[PDB]
């Protein structure tokens, strides 16, 4: 089915999109690097991020709400993708296949573009890394900087009251389940 194609290419492109962004940043740091200077300032940046992780960790008194919020955010993601799958089929049934096939065409063009750039970016980094020892240190420290960045934001999506948060997410789940049901009713109505 066309929507099986659409889903696949969106999955693959977003990952490419994310991975290319990281490579862009690495090259931007290694071309700009005076590399010893760049290393020092990455240490300080990672130092500041690790203390923020610690600060935010202490603002979390219990992991039990954290677990719950994480669980609800996952459920919300499941429900949204399923609602999107139902809306696409419903549009397709109502309005025909010309709209997916153009979307697919655009998605396969961007996919090829994204992969071409990925290969170029990755090729540039190997060249940039080259008989250099500082260069790997810079690689690791940027990688660490990426993970600490992600960790600070994870702890920011939590801390504000954790139970007010669970209250919100559970209301959103009610809305999505209501929407899911309407979309399935319209779908069965169409395929009758």
Author numbering: 2 to 34, 37 to 133, 135 to 163, 166 to 198
What does the report in the manuscript say about this coordinate set?
In the coiled-coil protein origami (CCPO) design strategy, CCs are used as modular building blocks to design protein nanostructures. The desired shape is defined through the topological arrangement of parallel and/or antiparallel CC dimers arranged into a precisely defined sequential order, based on the underlying mathematical rules. To address this issue, we sought to determine the crystal structure of the most elementary CCPO, the triangle. We designed a triangular protein using three orthogonal CC heterodimers concatenated in a single polypeptide chain.
We designed the variant TRI-4SHbGCN where P5:P6 is replaced by a GCN2 homodimer, and the segments are connected with GSG linkers. The asymmetric unit contains one TRI-4SHbGCN molecule with a triangular fold as designed. The triangle is nonequilateral with a shorter GCN2 side (34 Å) and two longer (47 Å) P1:P2 and P3:P4 sides. There is an internal cavity of about 600 Å2. The electron density is continuous for the entire chain, except for linker sequences, where only two linkers have clear density and could be modeled in the structure. These two linkers are attached to the P4 segment, suggesting this is a more rigid part of the structure, as also reflected in the lower average B-factor for P4. Interestingly, in the linker connecting P4 to P2 both Ser100 and Gly101 become part of the P2 helix and Ser100 side-chain hydrogen bonds to Trp95 on the preceding P4 segment. Therefore, the structures of CCs incorporated into the triangular fold remain essentially identical to the structures in isolation. An unexpected feature of the structure is the interactions between the CC segments at the vertices. A closer inspection of the TRI-4SHbGCN topology revealed that the chain forms a relatively shallow protein knot, known as the trefoil-type knot.
